[PDB]
Amino acid sequence: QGMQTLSSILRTIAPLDSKAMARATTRLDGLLKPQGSLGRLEQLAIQLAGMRGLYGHQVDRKQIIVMAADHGVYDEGVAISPRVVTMVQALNMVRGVTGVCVLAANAGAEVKIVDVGIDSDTLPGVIDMKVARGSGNIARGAAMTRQQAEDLLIASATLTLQQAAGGVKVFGVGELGMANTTPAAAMVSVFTDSDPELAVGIGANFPSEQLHHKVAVVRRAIETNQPDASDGIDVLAKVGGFDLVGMTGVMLGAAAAGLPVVLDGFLSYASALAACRIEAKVRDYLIPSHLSAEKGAVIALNHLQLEPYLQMGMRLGEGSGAALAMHLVDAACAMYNNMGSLAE
Amino acid sequence: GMQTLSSILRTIAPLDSKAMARATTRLDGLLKPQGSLGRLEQLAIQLAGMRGLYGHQVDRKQIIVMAADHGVYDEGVAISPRVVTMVQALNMVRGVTGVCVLAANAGAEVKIVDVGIDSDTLPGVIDMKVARGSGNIARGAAMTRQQAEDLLIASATLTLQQAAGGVKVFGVGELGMANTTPAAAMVSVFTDSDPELAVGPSEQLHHKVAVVRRAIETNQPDASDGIDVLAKVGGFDLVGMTGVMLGAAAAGLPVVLDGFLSYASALAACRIEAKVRDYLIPSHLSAEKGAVIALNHLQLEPYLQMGMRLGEGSGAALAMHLVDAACAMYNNMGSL
Ligand SMILES: [Cl-]
């Protein structure tokens, strides 16, 4: 009774409004320019026209939802930062001093920090959605139970839908989590039928001479858990983490609202792969931002069939890249709304 | 009385190495893994080296759009009627063009400059008109060397005046029916490429390649001489864009490139004074066929993959957001 079932939310994800997109195409073709000369900006304006949650290409209010959680696989020595940095950096987000904070402010976007599994108590100014104090160590077992993954998907999609009802027009995703590039690489390996050696990157400056150990840990996580690559919830629960689940839920909720959601980098690619496995109709609500510098970025993007607009060599995460692409969503709508056709 | 071009160029200095070293230290100390903001960090460092800037203050931005018609229109190589240059220039004044709405969204001004439209004087447009269109580069030079040099001076002087008026970031754009043909000619000459590689089965494409080949063969420009190439196989809009780059570099201020046409102007600008290159900021990867070769010779990698080919400065407007974001990161991110 309290919340909608996952199945019910998924069934509200509609294909894009093809008739709206056709009208938008005709309008863009008639504008003061050679046909198709604004390329992917035109494509973006048409894609947004198909999203029934929007009205008149009005996208003023934007909100990047940052999902924070700790990971049991930190115990395997795959991250160089102290584990406590997840908590401190979440507090730093409240202070407004992190990279996503200043880039979101520069883009006029809100930032909503959500605790879905930090190894800490409740944090002032951080939304309490905490499933547990850190995920299970994926190298020795599952990150979480299937039911925990499903319930968190429902909770984070529900939050997103509440924000949609409250007037948010464009979502973005980010995360915070020491060692979370290890589950992300495991998910990408499983979803793309890739050997982990192809998908495992340096994350937060993991020493290149120790990268073989990070590969070994991811390989062991997949061997131990044997996730079903066709089952997005199973992959999330077995070799994912709470932040990854939360980002998938935001994508599901935005698509269910009929609204755009802007991806970030490698971590968000893993969540996007799981979201599209759960409901393929989510893909057309996704807007890529930048091409992450993570080693497995190109493999993940190829399988999503998405081409990011920004090539910034970025690898911070937090949603900082999603913030940058917000300007492009603005630009597509500004071109659609304000550009002349036959003013004289 | 006007300054000489040489006197303007003398002001162009290499980037401030110590300032860039201090910027690198500051960025490494921010609350993030070292180097994790990648090219956004190196953009903030490049801006730290530009002595015309202070405190990564980049509030005021200006895209200067150079409009001119081209004699090689006579060879039938343009995709649209010649009058489009004039009509689009008037649409700029009204603020309804692509660059206008994108610049507004980026908080940049647009300055539309007539350097050679085939028309009477146009209201709302800056009158820098050398002539009613350039010479037909297929049959002879676009302009005399003196014409190119005097327009470089005028356009650099205008840019320097805008710098003194408070503009912190420049961008360039152009309007000009048939101007991808001189652009391809310049890129071919500057990069030692056959025009087939720089011109973008069809009868029209075959003819356009032949026209570019003929322009180079007729004019035999000296590829080592950026002014000679501009004068012989360029055009007034291309000269003006080069002049904006020279003036911005002389002021020590960044200038954001647009697409294929601006790459040709940038290649000429760097032939004229190599130190200009460090003040260039690429924007998007133009979908024009010869874009990659031109960018490779400039050793620039654009940030935006938009599949755009409109021109007019529209790509420069989009990159203004990245200049803004780099400075916001540098100025506002927390440290210890
Ligand atoms: Cl090992």
- Tokens 């030079």 correspond to what residue? B141
Ligand 1 centroid, distance to A196 Cα (angstroms): 13
**Does the beta carbon of A60 lie under 8 angstroms from any beta carbon of chain B?**
no
Angle at B222 between CA B234 and CA B156, to 5 degrees: 50
Asked if B151 and B45 touch (Cβ cutoff 8 Å), the reply is no
Question: What is the bridge-based pairing of β-strands A127-128 and A109-117?
Answer: parallel
DSSP class of residue B287? -
- Chain B residues in contact with A324 by the CB 8 A cut-off are 321-322, 325
Which among A147, A149, A150, A237 has a CA at the least distance from the CA of A186?
A: A237
Q: What is the torsion angle, in degrees rounded to the nearest 10, for the CA atoms of residue B70, residue B71, residue B73 and residue B74?
A: 170
Strand partners, B116: B68
Q: Is B332 on the interface with A (CB under 8 A)?
A: yes
Q: Which residues of A touch B303 (CB under 8 A)?
A: 310-312
Same domain flag for B52 and B75: no
Give CA–CA dist A115/A135, Å, rounded: 12
CB of A64 closer than 8 Å to CB of A325: no
Q: Which helix (H) or strand (E) holds B175?
A: strand B169-175
Question: Domain containing B68 — which CATH number?
Answer: 3.40.50.10210
Q: Please, which residues have CB less than 5 A from ligand 1, an ion?
A: A 213, 216
Q: How many residues are listed for chain A in this entry?
A: 344
Element (H, E) at B5: helix B5-9
Catalytic residue among B75, B149, B273, B312: B312
Query: What does the block give as tokens for A244?
Result: 């990854």
| DSSP structure class, residue B289 | T
Task: Give the CA dihedral A50, A54, A57, A60, nearest 10 degrees.
Answer: -140
Clarify whether residues B9 and B147 are in a common domain. no
The answer to whether residues A199 and A157 belong to one domain is yes
- Going from the Cα of A217 to the center of ligand 1, the distance in angstroms, rounded, reads 7
CB pairs under 8 A between A and B: 148
CB-CB contact of B209 with B187 (8 Å)? no
- Is the domain of B97 the same as that of B23? no
**Cα gap A49→A83, rounded to integer Å:** 43
Q: How far is the CA of A215 from the centre of ligand 1 (A)?
A: 8
What's the token pair of residue A63?
A: 């909100």
Given a contact cutoff of 8 angstroms between Cβ atoms, the answer to whether B50 and B254 are in contact is: yes
Q: Any chain A CB within 8 A of the CB of B98? A: yes
CA A43 to CA B20: how far, in whole Å?
38
Mark whether B48 and B188 lie in a shared domain. no
Give the integer Cα–Cα distance in Å for A311 and A332.
18
- B32 at A interface, C-beta within 8 A: yes
Both A89 and A159 in a single domain?
A: yes
Tell me the torsion sign for CA atoms A222, A223, A224, A230.
positive
> Does A174 lie in the same domain as A106?
yes
A12/B311 Cα distance (integer angstroms): 41
**Contact of A214 with A131, CB cutoff 8 Å:** no
Task: Kindly state whether A204 is in contact with chain B, defined as any CB-CB distance less than 8 angstroms.
Answer: yes
Query: For residue B181, what are the domain limits?
Result: 58-324
CATH number, position A51: 1.10.1610.10
List all residues 6 or more positions away from A74 whose beta carbon is below 8 Å from its beta carbon. Answer: A83, A134, A178, A179
Interface test with A, best of B88, B101, B323 (most A CBs within 10 A): B101
Q: Which residues contact B206 (CB under 8 A, 6 or more apart)?
A: none
Instruction: Tell me, yes or no, if B321 comes closer than 8 A to chain A by beta carbon.
Output: yes
- B98/B19 same-domain check: no
Residue in the block written with tokens 């004039």:
B86
Cβ proximity of A46 and A28 under 8 Å: yes
For this structure, is B312 an active site residue? yes
Last residue before each gap in chain B (C to N over 2.5 A):
200
Residue A220, both tokens: 């062991």
CA distance A124 to B139: 74
Q: For residue A319, which of A235, A233, A236, A246 has the smallest C-alpha distance?
A: A246
The whole-angstrom separation of Cα B285 and Cα B299 is: 13
**Contact at CB, B329 and A103, closer than 8 angstroms:** yes
Interval between CA A207 and ligand 1 midpoint (Å): 14
Identify whether residues A156 and A35 lie together within a single domain: no
Token pair belonging to B26 = 């500051």
A40 interaction partners in chain B (CB closer than 8 Å): 305-308
Burial A268-282 (b: 16+ CB within 10 A, else e): bbbbbbbbbbbbebb
Total residue count of chain B as it appears in this document:
336
Q: Identify the bridge partners of residue A12 per DSSP, sorted by sequence position.
A: none
CB-based contact, B37 to chain A, within 8 Å = yes
* B310 SS3 class: coil
Tokens of A120: 């800490």
Q: How far apart are CA B227 and CA B234, in angstroms?
A: 9
Question: Angle, nearest 10°, between helix axes A99-106 and A85-95?
Answer: 30
Q: For residue A308, which residues of chain B lie inside 8 Å, CB to CB?
A: 305
Q: How far apart are CA A120 and CA B329, in angstroms?
A: 29
Residues A266/A294, Cβ–Cβ less than 8 Å:
yes
CA distances from B191 to A30, B184, B199, B333 (A): 37, 10, 13, 41
Q: Whose structure tokens read 């003819």? A: B207
B102 contacts A315? CB cut-off 8 A: no
- In whole angstroms, give the CA distance from residue B233 to residue B214: 10
The Cα of A244 is separated from the nearest Cα of chain B by a number of Å equal to: 20
Cβ–Cβ of A33/B318 closer than 8 Å? Answer: no
Q: Are residues A184 and A44 in the same domain?
A: no
Cα of B17 from ligand 1 centre, angstroms: 43
Q: Report the domain count for chain B.
A: 2
Q: Which chain B residue shows the shortest CA-CA distance from A79? A: B33
Residues B62 and B47 grouped into a single domain: no
Q: State how beta strands B169-175 and B255-256 pair.
A: parallel
Contacts of residue A201 in chain B, CB cutoff 8 Å? Answer: none
Task: Show the 3-state SS of chain A.
Answer: CCCCCHHHHHHCCCCCCHHHHHHHHHHHHCCCCCCCCCHHHHHHHHHHHCCCCCCCCCCCCEEEEEEEECCHHHHHCCCCCCCCHHHHHHHHHHHCCCHHHHHHHHCCEEEEEEEEECCCCCCCCCEECCCCCCCCCCCCCCCCCHHHHHHHHHHHHHHHHHHHHCCCCEEEEEEECCCCHHHHHHHHHHHCCCCHHHHCCCCCCCCHHHHHHHHHHHHHHHHHHCCCCCCHHHHHHHHCCHHHHHHHHHHHHHHHHCCCEECCCHHHHHHHHHHHHHCHHHHHHEECCECCCCCCHHHHHHHHCCCCCECCCCCCCCCHHHHHHHHHHHHHHHHHHHCCCCCC
Lookup: tokens for A95 = 């202070």
Q: Which long-range contacts (CB under 8 A, 24 or more apart) does B99-102 make?
A: B99/B63, B99/B65, B99/B173, B99/B312, B99/B313, B99/B314, B99/B316, B99/B317, B101/A334, B101/A335, B101/A338, B101/A339, B102/A331, B102/A334, B102/A335, B102/B314, B102/B317, B102/B318
Residue B197 in contact with partner chain A when CB distance is under 8 A? no
What does the alpha-carbon distance between residue B307 and residue A42 come to, in Å, rounded to a whole number?
10
Contacts of B34 in chain A (CB under 8 A): 205
Residues B235 and B308 in one domain: yes
d(CA A232, CA B206): 51
* Number of Cβ atoms within 10 Å of the Cβ of A209: 7
What sign does the dihedral B278-B146-B194-B198 (CA atoms) show? Answer: positive
Contacts of B143 (CB under 8 A, 6+ apart): B130, B131, B134, B135, B151, B231, B234, B236, B239
Smallest CA–CA separation between B10 and chain A, in Å?
33
* CB proximity A174 to B under 8 Å: no
Which pair of tokens denotes residue B51? Answer: 């002595």
B123 contacts chain A (CB < 8 A):
no
A41: closest chain B residue by CA: B306
Reduced to 3 states, what is the DSSP secondary structure of residue B223? coil
Residues of A with catalytic roles: 318
The two tokens of residue B256 are 């954001």
Question: Chain A: residue nearest B89 by CA?
Answer: A32
DSSP lists the bridge partners of residue A55 as none
Nearest to B105 among A40, A307, A330 (CB): A330
In the chain, the amino acid numbered B136 is N
Q: Give the CA-trace dihedral at A283, A67, A308, A229, to 10 degrees.
A: -50
In angstroms, rounded to a whole number, what is the distance separating the alpha carbons of residues A241 and A138? 9
Helix, strand, coil percentages for chain B (3-state, nearest 5): 50, 10, 40
Helix (H) or strand (E) holding B262: helix B260-272
* Separation in Å, CA of A230 to nearest CA in chain B: 31
